[PDB]
Amino acid sequence: QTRHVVNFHSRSESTIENFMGRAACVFMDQYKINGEETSTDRFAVWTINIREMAQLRRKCEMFTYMRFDIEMTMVITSCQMPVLTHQIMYVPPGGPIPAKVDGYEWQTSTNPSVFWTEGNAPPRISIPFISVGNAYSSFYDGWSHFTQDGTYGYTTLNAMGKLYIRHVNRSSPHQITSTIRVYFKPKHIKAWVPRPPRLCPYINKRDVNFVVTEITDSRTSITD
């Protein structure tokens, strides 16, 4: 490459909606169709949070507070029959969860769910700003239980819900193993209180713990 005259004047790509509002795959999971009537491998879960993969997690930690609608579009495949129909049930933060693929929670009228049959365009489900407070908090320097009990750093304001996914087909002659890819996207996003970027690598998906990392890459002397 060579250093060219990069002559233009634009910061439309540096706004918050043009920086955060990009769809990224945040959840791959397998789920079967038949066998093991009491099993946990016939549906998917994915509690919705921004701390899924470190590339997106890093961008949400530029800012302390942010509020945004989310608009996820699943991309569902299958392996190994009839034409298959799926169900992507979003439960709110206050919502019952299934324990099995044939639980009664799947029939709850307050849990919105899409019934996508195979071959069409991917299913898209949009979720508004659910939180109780006025913004989602990326960081919470505080304790969930009063009087400095356990569970540091986890507030219940930035709870977004869960996403239970199953086949609606009751059975099949052979085994069908479906794969789902959830494409998370912030929408109509506002952000408050900027914050310095992450320096150290991430350890765990529910905490801010880190190993002490060097500031920059080292060089030989101060003058070279």
Partner: protein, 102 residues
Amino acid sequence: FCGSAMATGKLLISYSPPGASVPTSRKDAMLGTHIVWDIGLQSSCVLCVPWISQSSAGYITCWYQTNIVVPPGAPTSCDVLCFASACNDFSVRLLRDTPFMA
């Protein structure tokens, strides 16, 4: 300049254009672009470096014009902090993933 309130000296902050070679001596840095920054008068000297873009860059060297002159009470060795931001307005186009995260 984070030294004493009694330490006094001069530093010569030279700037090389993106094509030019670095000054090997203090005189050759004086013949280019520089600012003889008197520490005893002002303690904070501000630059504004243009022609900064990518899609072979400049140099900010610093030289002893004079040594640090110090009374018997104040310490001899001092420190200089540096800062950096966008000078007036900054242009930026094509979003990508950062290299640091693995």
